[PDB]
Short mmCIF file of C-alpha atoms in Angstrom, two decimals:
data_model
loop_
_atom_site.label_atom_id
_atom_site.label_comp_id
_atom_site.label_asym_id
_atom_site.label_seq_id
_atom_site.Cartn_x
_atom_site.Cartn_y
_atom_site.Cartn_z
CA UNK W 1 -35.38 17.08 7.31
CA UNK W 2 -32.52 14.64 8.18
CA UNK W 3 -28.92 15.90 8.24
CA UNK W 4 -26.33 14.37 5.86
CA UNK W 5 -24.16 12.89 8.67
CA UNK W 6 -25.56 10.18 10.92
CA UNK W 7 -24.39 7.33 13.10
CA UNK W 8 -25.77 4.33 14.96
CA UNK W 9 -25.07 2.71 18.31
CA UNK W 10 -24.38 -1.04 18.36
CA UNK W 11 -27.95 -2.22 19.00
CA UNK W 12 -29.31 0.08 16.28
CA UNK W 13 -26.60 -1.11 13.85
CA UNK W 14 -27.53 -4.74 14.61
CA UNK W 15 -31.19 -3.94 13.80
CA UNK W 16 -30.16 -2.00 10.63
CA UNK W 17 -28.39 -5.13 9.33
CA UNK W 18 -31.27 -7.52 10.15
CA UNK W 19 -32.96 -9.06 7.10
CA UNK W 20 -36.27 -7.22 7.81
CA UNK W 21 -34.46 -3.82 7.42
CA UNK W 22 -32.68 -4.44 4.06
CA UNK W 23 -34.58 -1.69 2.28
CA UNK W 24 -34.08 0.95 5.03
CA UNK W 25 -30.33 0.16 5.03
CA UNK W 26 -30.05 0.50 1.22
CA UNK W 27 -31.78 3.87 1.28
CA UNK W 28 -29.72 4.96 4.32
CA UNK W 29 -26.44 4.04 2.58
CA UNK W 30 -27.60 5.65 -0.70
CA UNK W 31 -28.49 8.98 0.94
CA UNK W 32 -26.43 9.55 4.14
CA UNK W 33 -22.84 9.64 5.29
CA UNK W 34 -22.65 7.13 8.15
CA UNK W 35 -19.80 7.55 10.66
CA UNK W 36 -19.41 4.54 13.00
CA UNK W 37 -17.10 4.56 15.98
CA UNK W 38 -14.72 1.56 15.98
CA UNK W 39 -16.26 0.77 19.40
CA UNK W 40 -19.73 0.47 17.80
CA UNK W 41 -18.15 -1.70 15.10
CA UNK W 42 -16.46 -3.80 17.81
CA UNK W 43 -19.74 -4.44 19.65
CA UNK W 44 -21.67 -5.23 16.45
CA UNK W 45 -18.86 -7.69 15.60
CA UNK W 46 -19.18 -9.46 18.97
CA UNK W 47 -22.87 -10.03 18.13
CA UNK W 48 -21.85 -11.35 14.68
CA UNK W 49 -19.05 -13.55 16.11
CA UNK W 50 -21.70 -15.17 18.32
CA UNK W 51 -23.03 -16.85 15.10
CA UNK W 52 -20.01 -17.18 12.77
CA UNK W 53 -16.44 -18.56 13.01
CA UNK W 54 -15.18 -15.87 10.56
CA UNK W 55 -15.93 -12.17 11.20
CA UNK W 56 -13.05 -10.70 9.16
CA UNK W 57 -14.94 -10.69 5.86
CA UNK W 58 -17.82 -8.99 7.69
CA UNK W 59 -15.49 -6.24 8.93
CA UNK W 60 -14.12 -5.62 5.44
CA UNK W 61 -17.68 -5.02 4.18
CA UNK W 62 -18.38 -2.57 7.05
CA UNK W 63 -15.12 -0.72 6.31
CA UNK W 64 -16.28 -0.25 2.69
CA UNK W 65 -19.91 0.81 3.27
CA UNK W 66 -19.20 3.01 6.38
CA UNK W 67 -16.70 5.57 7.67
CA UNK W 68 -15.24 3.70 10.63
CA UNK W 69 -13.88 6.37 12.98
CA UNK W 70 -10.98 5.27 15.23
CA UNK W 71 -10.68 6.11 18.90
CA UNK W 72 -8.61 9.15 17.94
CA UNK W 73 -6.54 11.12 20.41
CA UNK W 74 -9.01 14.09 20.13
CA UNK W 75 -11.86 11.65 20.91
CA UNK W 76 -9.92 10.09 23.82
CA UNK W 77 -9.28 13.62 25.16
CA UNK W 78 -12.88 14.86 24.65
CA UNK W 79 -14.37 11.64 26.07
CA UNK W 80 -12.26 11.98 29.20
CA UNK W 81 -13.50 15.58 29.73
CA UNK W 82 -17.16 14.61 29.19
CA UNK W 83 -16.94 11.52 31.41
CA UNK W 84 -15.26 13.51 34.23
CA UNK W 85 -17.97 16.18 34.08
CA UNK W 86 -20.83 13.63 34.16
CA UNK W 87 -19.33 11.62 37.09
CA UNK W 88 -19.20 14.92 39.09
CA UNK W 89 -22.96 15.23 38.44
CA UNK W 90 -23.41 11.66 39.87
CA UNK W 91 -23.83 10.21 36.31
CA UNK W 92 -21.43 7.45 35.27
CA UNK W 93 -22.02 5.83 31.89
CA UNK W 94 -20.54 2.85 30.06
CA UNK W 95 -17.39 3.24 27.93
CA UNK W 96 -19.30 2.27 24.79
CA UNK W 97 -21.85 5.07 25.28
CA UNK W 98 -19.26 7.80 26.02
CA UNK W 99 -17.09 6.92 23.00
CA UNK W 100 -20.11 6.46 20.67
CA UNK W 101 -21.52 9.81 21.87
CA UNK W 102 -18.20 11.68 21.80
CA UNK W 103 -17.44 10.34 18.31
CA UNK W 104 -20.87 11.61 17.16
CA UNK W 105 -20.13 15.11 18.54
CA UNK W 106 -16.70 15.02 16.86
CA UNK W 107 -18.12 14.10 13.42
CA UNK W 108 -21.29 16.26 13.88
CA UNK W 109 -23.31 13.06 13.36
CA UNK W 110 -26.89 12.62 14.55
CA UNK W 111 -26.98 9.53 16.78
CA UNK W 112 -29.78 7.17 15.69
CA UNK W 113 -30.55 4.88 18.63
CA UNK W 114 -33.14 2.54 20.15
CA UNK W 115 -32.55 4.12 23.58
CA UNK W 116 -32.00 7.91 23.27
CA UNK W 117 -32.81 8.46 26.97
CA UNK W 118 -29.57 6.62 27.90
CA UNK W 119 -27.59 9.41 26.13
CA UNK W 120 -29.75 12.34 27.42
CA UNK W 121 -27.09 13.53 29.93
CA UNK W 122 -24.57 13.96 27.06
CA UNK W 123 -26.82 16.30 25.01
CA UNK W 124 -25.41 19.21 27.09
CA UNK W 125 -22.07 18.68 25.29
CA UNK W 126 -23.53 18.91 21.75
CA UNK W 127 -24.90 15.40 21.07
CA UNK W 128 -28.11 15.20 19.05
CA UNK W 129 -30.16 11.98 19.01
CA UNK W 130 -33.16 10.45 17.27
CA UNK W 131 -35.14 7.29 18.11
CA UNK W 132 -34.61 4.47 15.57
CA UNK W 133 -38.38 4.04 15.13
CA UNK W 134 -38.55 7.71 14.05
CA UNK W 135 -35.49 7.44 11.78
CA UNK W 136 -37.06 4.45 10.04
CA UNK W 137 -40.39 6.28 9.55
CA UNK W 138 -38.53 9.25 8.01
CA UNK W 139 -36.66 6.90 5.66
CA UNK W 140 -40.03 5.29 4.73
CA UNK W 141 -41.35 8.82 4.01
CA UNK W 142 -38.59 9.13 1.40
CA UNK W 143 -40.98 7.57 -1.15
CA UNK W 144 -41.37 9.26 -4.60
CA UNK X 1 10.50 -12.86 35.43
CA UNK X 2 9.31 -10.12 33.14
CA UNK X 3 9.33 -10.40 29.34
CA UNK X 4 10.61 -7.62 27.04
CA UNK X 5 7.10 -6.28 26.39
CA UNK X 6 4.88 -5.15 29.25
CA UNK X 7 1.54 -3.35 29.53
CA UNK X 8 -0.49 -1.91 32.41
CA UNK X 9 -4.21 -1.51 32.94
CA UNK X 10 -5.41 1.96 34.00
CA UNK X 11 -5.20 1.63 37.78
CA UNK X 12 -1.73 0.05 37.51
CA UNK X 13 -0.70 2.96 35.26
CA UNK X 14 -2.11 5.47 37.75
CA UNK X 15 0.01 3.95 40.58
CA UNK X 16 3.00 3.77 38.22
CA UNK X 17 2.90 7.57 37.72
CA UNK X 18 2.78 8.40 41.44
CA UNK X 19 5.74 10.34 42.82
CA UNK X 20 6.67 7.59 45.29
CA UNK X 21 6.96 5.14 42.31
CA UNK X 22 9.16 7.42 40.08
CA UNK X 23 12.22 5.15 40.29
CA UNK X 24 10.26 1.96 39.43
CA UNK X 25 8.75 3.74 36.41
CA UNK X 26 12.10 5.08 35.11
CA UNK X 27 13.70 1.59 35.21
CA UNK X 28 10.53 0.11 33.67
CA UNK X 29 10.62 2.56 30.76
CA UNK X 30 14.42 2.13 30.43
CA UNK X 31 14.59 -1.70 30.45
CA UNK X 32 11.24 -2.68 28.84
CA UNK X 33 8.95 -1.79 25.97
CA UNK X 34 5.63 -0.63 27.47
CA UNK X 35 2.65 -0.94 25.11
CA UNK X 36 -0.48 0.90 26.24
CA UNK X 37 -3.95 0.34 24.75
CA UNK X 38 -5.62 3.63 23.76
CA UNK X 39 -8.40 2.37 26.11
CA UNK X 40 -6.00 2.42 29.04
CA UNK X 41 -4.78 5.90 28.06
CA UNK X 42 -8.41 7.08 27.84
CA UNK X 43 -9.20 5.68 31.33
CA UNK X 44 -6.10 7.38 32.81
CA UNK X 45 -7.01 10.69 31.13
CA UNK X 46 -10.52 10.53 32.62
CA UNK X 47 -8.91 10.38 36.11
CA UNK X 48 -6.74 13.36 35.21
CA UNK X 49 -9.81 15.20 33.79
CA UNK X 50 -11.58 14.53 37.11
CA UNK X 51 -8.63 16.26 38.85
CA UNK X 52 -8.86 19.23 36.39
CA UNK X 53 -5.44 18.62 34.86
CA UNK X 54 -4.31 19.84 31.43
CA UNK X 55 -5.54 16.81 29.44
CA UNK X 56 -4.01 17.72 26.04
CA UNK X 57 -0.60 18.05 27.72
CA UNK X 58 -1.14 14.86 29.79
CA UNK X 59 -1.89 12.93 26.57
CA UNK X 60 1.25 14.38 24.93
CA UNK X 61 3.31 13.34 27.98
CA UNK X 62 1.99 9.77 27.56
CA UNK X 63 2.56 9.64 23.80
CA UNK X 64 6.09 11.07 24.30
CA UNK X 65 7.01 8.05 26.51
CA UNK X 66 4.76 5.05 25.67
CA UNK X 67 4.01 3.17 22.49
CA UNK X 68 0.23 3.73 22.40
CA UNK X 69 -1.48 0.90 20.52
CA UNK X 70 -4.71 2.03 18.78
CA UNK X 71 -7.85 -0.11 18.59
CA UNK X 72 -6.43 -1.77 15.48
CA UNK X 73 -8.48 -3.80 13.01
CA UNK X 74 -6.91 -7.08 14.17
CA UNK X 75 -7.48 -6.12 17.82
CA UNK X 76 -11.14 -5.31 17.12
CA UNK X 77 -11.62 -8.64 15.27
CA UNK X 78 -9.73 -10.73 17.84
CA UNK X 79 -11.39 -8.98 20.79
CA UNK X 80 -14.83 -9.77 19.32
CA UNK X 81 -13.97 -13.43 18.75
CA UNK X 82 -12.76 -13.55 22.35
CA UNK X 83 -15.85 -11.82 23.81
CA UNK X 84 -18.36 -14.02 21.89
CA UNK X 85 -16.50 -17.16 23.04
CA UNK X 86 -16.71 -15.92 26.64
CA UNK X 87 -20.35 -14.75 26.56
CA UNK X 88 -21.32 -18.26 25.31
CA UNK X 89 -19.95 -19.60 28.66
CA UNK X 90 -21.98 -16.92 30.54
CA UNK X 91 -18.84 -14.82 31.12
CA UNK X 92 -19.84 -11.16 31.07
CA UNK X 93 -16.70 -9.03 30.73
CA UNK X 94 -16.19 -5.28 30.45
CA UNK X 95 -15.22 -3.85 27.04
CA UNK X 96 -12.09 -2.11 28.35
CA UNK X 97 -10.82 -5.32 30.01
CA UNK X 98 -11.42 -7.26 26.76
CA UNK X 99 -9.60 -4.64 24.65
CA UNK X 100 -6.76 -4.25 27.18
CA UNK X 101 -6.22 -8.03 27.37
CA UNK X 102 -6.58 -8.54 23.62
CA UNK X 103 -4.11 -5.68 23.00
CA UNK X 104 -1.63 -7.46 25.34
CA UNK X 105 -2.02 -10.77 23.47
CA UNK X 106 -1.55 -8.88 20.17
CA UNK X 107 1.73 -7.20 21.29
CA UNK X 108 2.74 -10.23 23.48
CA UNK X 109 2.96 -7.91 26.45
CA UNK X 110 2.81 -9.14 30.03
CA UNK X 111 -0.29 -7.48 31.50
CA UNK X 112 0.67 -6.00 34.87
CA UNK X 113 -2.41 -5.32 36.99
CA UNK X 114 -3.84 -4.85 40.47
CA UNK X 115 -6.62 -7.31 39.73
CA UNK X 116 -5.25 -10.28 37.72
CA UNK X 117 -8.39 -12.34 38.58
CA UNK X 118 -10.69 -10.25 36.30
CA UNK X 119 -8.63 -11.24 33.20
CA UNK X 120 -8.38 -14.93 34.19
CA UNK X 121 -11.01 -16.13 31.67
CA UNK X 122 -8.85 -14.61 28.89
CA UNK X 123 -5.64 -16.51 29.84
CA UNK X 124 -6.80 -19.49 27.71
CA UNK X 125 -6.41 -17.34 24.55
CA UNK X 126 -2.74 -16.56 25.36
CA UNK X 127 -2.81 -13.74 27.93
CA UNK X 128 -0.27 -13.80 30.74
CA UNK X 129 -0.81 -11.58 33.79
CA UNK X 130 1.28 -10.53 36.80
CA UNK X 131 0.12 -8.92 40.08
CA UNK X 132 1.28 -5.32 40.42
CA UNK X 133 3.01 -5.87 43.79
CA UNK X 134 5.12 -8.70 42.27
CA UNK X 135 6.05 -6.52 39.31
CA UNK X 136 7.20 -3.77 41.69
CA UNK X 137 9.37 -6.25 43.63
CA UNK X 138 11.03 -7.49 40.42
CA UNK X 139 11.82 -3.89 39.42
CA UNK X 140 12.94 -3.00 42.98
CA UNK X 141 15.59 -5.71 42.89
CA UNK X 142 16.82 -4.46 39.47
CA UNK X 143 17.08 -0.92 40.95
CA UNK X 144 19.20 -2.06 43.92
CA UNK X 145 21.14 -4.26 41.42
#
């Protein structure tokens, strides 16, 4: 029941690359198109650079296995419109969340996340989400 | 003294595009290379979106006059290395400020800003900042000649 195009936020991506999720990641990469915002990639890389002196090799691997979507002009434009609208409704969200969410709408990617409630105000603009625990379970259910 | 390459953060850029600053801006664009992070552009456009302006046209206007620097690979990598270094010293910094500063280091732009203090932990990596009021004075004197 999962659509072909998905994405992750930074915390979800960090969990997806943890050693205990190897098998879910392999299946995910074998069966979905994964479109990561450069901003998500940036934040994941800050978590990686906390441990390692070299993160460049890491980035090259991500660029191969994922579609890394830049902060395109259309995304900058659409993010500005969404963020303006939310602020008027007394809701002001972090840059990372707006760009992640707007990039997901732009690529028609389902946003797999540990905290889907944080993006609930953006669903009005076409964003679809799924909890990571539920994504994982659905990947586990892909079993013969 | 201003170097050849300059950049603004979003609130500086907002003030720079005010009517009463038109002459400062024209000389700035004429005598310097201004290099804007896509982050900065995005922040500016959010303010324009809030005022119900034509955002496609406002982005075109900006691209027609500034060199807009994307979130390049090297910027992403360097920014991350910077942020991790800083977080390890218990320095929490905002993504946009990290990208804006890192983009300035990458293009060797002087970062002109209202709030130089918030980028002060990044100066160790090569960033140079200037207060906006001092920038305006430098450009004023060039105008009067």
